[PDB]
Symmetry: C3
Subunit: 279 residues, 3 copies
């Protein structure tokens, strides 16, 4: 676009602290600040070409780690036990993530860039595949922008983790709010044991990298329903209420017993007066 | 194409009656006419820009509704209990579905059009997610054509609903018939509890919006096998017997115990004399 | 590309022998030579336009067959019981597979070519859907190249067959080896009863036909995680260790209990001295 904000060229070196901690109720979560850990962990958004040094501190009583999808990392920052890149209790390690722009290789072929919707999670809590860590909440989203990507007003993360959304008790959302016309970005991630189908009432997106059609040539299927499995991640943007107006629009897993057993939430799209028709 | 028939520009306002009724054997189905209800319900095909007013009448003894994927609807035509848009027994409600062409937004971005393979189903029978209604047969296909889309000779709907095809008893098809050379469109929909993989012997299509490659630039994978989950919908066209000739070509779920337990049917492609080699 | 090797135009008629045999331990596998049967069966790679005549011999004590995805075959070479194209014990049959280039049809539309990542398997051992044959190991990969496709240094086949990789005992790989910079092709196939998610540490590919982006216009999502179901097949190429260096990079099903129960292997990327950092 040319009036929406778009991502700039990347290439910063960025530093950042993360903590893994046990939560009072038995869950585990990441944070940028000790005592401010969340499930999902905080969004990490960078631009293609950025380099990110994460001073990670495991504050728990068991070994834990930080593993990322899609981004360039050396085996040093694998986050696995095998490759000795996990972290002892109370320990601190610096993971490094790099990203790159697309371009021609010398053999004439086209190297894909790092741009996309990704995620990070533990790889050593409970099992050598982080099964316990993931079940407990050690997962969070990563976004890598390509230069020129359209930027949203807000970004929400929805994680189907086993039979929960964002580790919440059945039928407790989360719910999100927008005003009609808002540019809303969704990062959607699945974890655990089961397949799901993500569905949104009243909105749809493109089944490509960005969730947006480039222009009239993009043959990508347009959808409002997408099957997902453990560690899948995709994202998209929509205009809230576009062509459909305000309302309490559901989103849910469309697997019938999942939605029945509580994998449901609300996308509350409001008129400017903050009202929602019949809610 | 330029010799195949193609869809015209849309923009009609269309009216239409639908009924939901209980069938003699305990199933539930939609119809355009009372007493002519089917599972799957009738195809609804429109053009991008069309508006469709459906005079829906619930003739059953329990509340029922009509919910659609992909198409523009206001929350009034949500078809959910929450938003008060379901229908009392013997009641009548007018749902409205709109569709739109793609184009530029003012922010410079590209709005996707409504064009695609979609579906409709109940959202309130049995549970607040229509689990009972869907299991009983309250589902049907919707097609939205983009101006210039290639039109087929015939359109067949295949629905993997839990462990059945089109709610049929195991190993009872459906079977479809074509003559070699026919342009056959398939709308494929999944419902219920399970994932599946749809497979066709002897034919293949594009994994994009239409199931057809635009021309040589379309990088879409060409496939004869596709994993699907509850509420997924896609469609495609093939030339019957193209490059392979007449025959009784199977289609089935490729999940091994599903095909074994009966999720199988026949695509009977005939020579002009109506014969099928070795059948 | 223009320095990588690329596939030539097709159109050869090729002949070839295959055998199905029972293995000493109770499995079943295909081979190009009697006594040299493998699970997965040997790669069959051809060019668009090639024709392949396979002199198939069933050396087992039960009926068996050869069924292929994606490629053109007449119903004579269906490989099914129904269509009488399976093979009696000790019997010999000649299957024929053809392939075609894409191009314009007379109706003006675009016929897709045969190019892609496909597979072959039994259709009659154990059940009329080859459930027993597939479980026992009667499956192998097929690659059809389009003229101009980039050719790799090596091609590896990974098959998630029920809860095994390539029918191996849990936690026994397979492992693959490359040197940093190698062009590695992966053909990934799923069989049996379950869905999976294929994941690779440290590498990513395009979710299109080839696994490679054409250039900057290709909107295909770039991924390192892909959900798959029975009879799904896709493929891709990566540069070993590109942007990430040498190391013992894991690949696994990301379904948590699968990786835990053993669906894991190693992509061993080496420095030229053959060493792998921390292994
Ligand atoms: Cu891993
Ligand atoms: Cu679910
Ligand atoms: Cu819906
Ligand atoms: Cu992961
Ligand atoms: Cu719903
Ligand atoms: Cu199935
Ligand atoms: Cu097949
Ligand atoms: Cu639905
Ligand atoms: Cu079959
Ligand atoms: Cu698995
Ligand atoms: Cu990983
Ligand atoms: Cu098959």
């Amino acid at each position: 676009g040319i009036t929406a904000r778009t991502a700039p060229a990347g290439g910063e070196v960025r530093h950042l602290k993360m903590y893994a901690e046990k939560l009072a109720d038995g869950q585990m979560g990441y944070g940028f600040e000790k005592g401010k850990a969340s499930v999902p962990g905080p969004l990490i958004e960078v631009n293609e070409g950025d380099t990110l040094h994460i001073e990670f501190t495991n504050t728990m009583d068991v070994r834990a780690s930080l593993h990322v999808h899609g981004l360039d990392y050396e085996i040093s920052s694998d986050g696995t036990a095998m490759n000795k890149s996990d972290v002892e209790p109370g320990g601190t390690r610096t993971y490094t993530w790099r990203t790159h722009k697309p371009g021609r290789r010398d053999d004439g072929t086209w190297r894909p860039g790092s741009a996309g919707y990704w995620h990070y999670h533990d790889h050593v809590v409970g099992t050598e595949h982080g099964t316990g860590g993931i079940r407990n909440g050690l997962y969070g989203p990563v976004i890598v922008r390509r230069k020129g990507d359209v930027l949203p007003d807000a970004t929400h993360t929805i994680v189907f983790n086993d039979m929960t959304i964002n580790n919440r008790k059945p039928h407790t959302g989360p719910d999100f709010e927008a005003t009609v016309g808002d540019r809303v970005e969704i990062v959607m991630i699945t974890h655990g044991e089961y397949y799901h189908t993500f569905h949104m009432h009243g909105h749809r997106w493109a089944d490509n990298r960005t969730g947006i059609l480039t222009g009239p040539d993009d043959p990508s299927r347009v959808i409002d329903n997408k099957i997902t499995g453990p560690a899948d991640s995709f994202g998209f943007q929509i205009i809230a209420g576009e062509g459909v107006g305000a309302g309490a629009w559901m989103y849910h897993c469309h697997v019938q017993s999942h939605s029945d057993m509580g994998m449901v939430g609300l996308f509350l799209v409001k008129k400017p007066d903050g009202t929602i028709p019949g809610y």
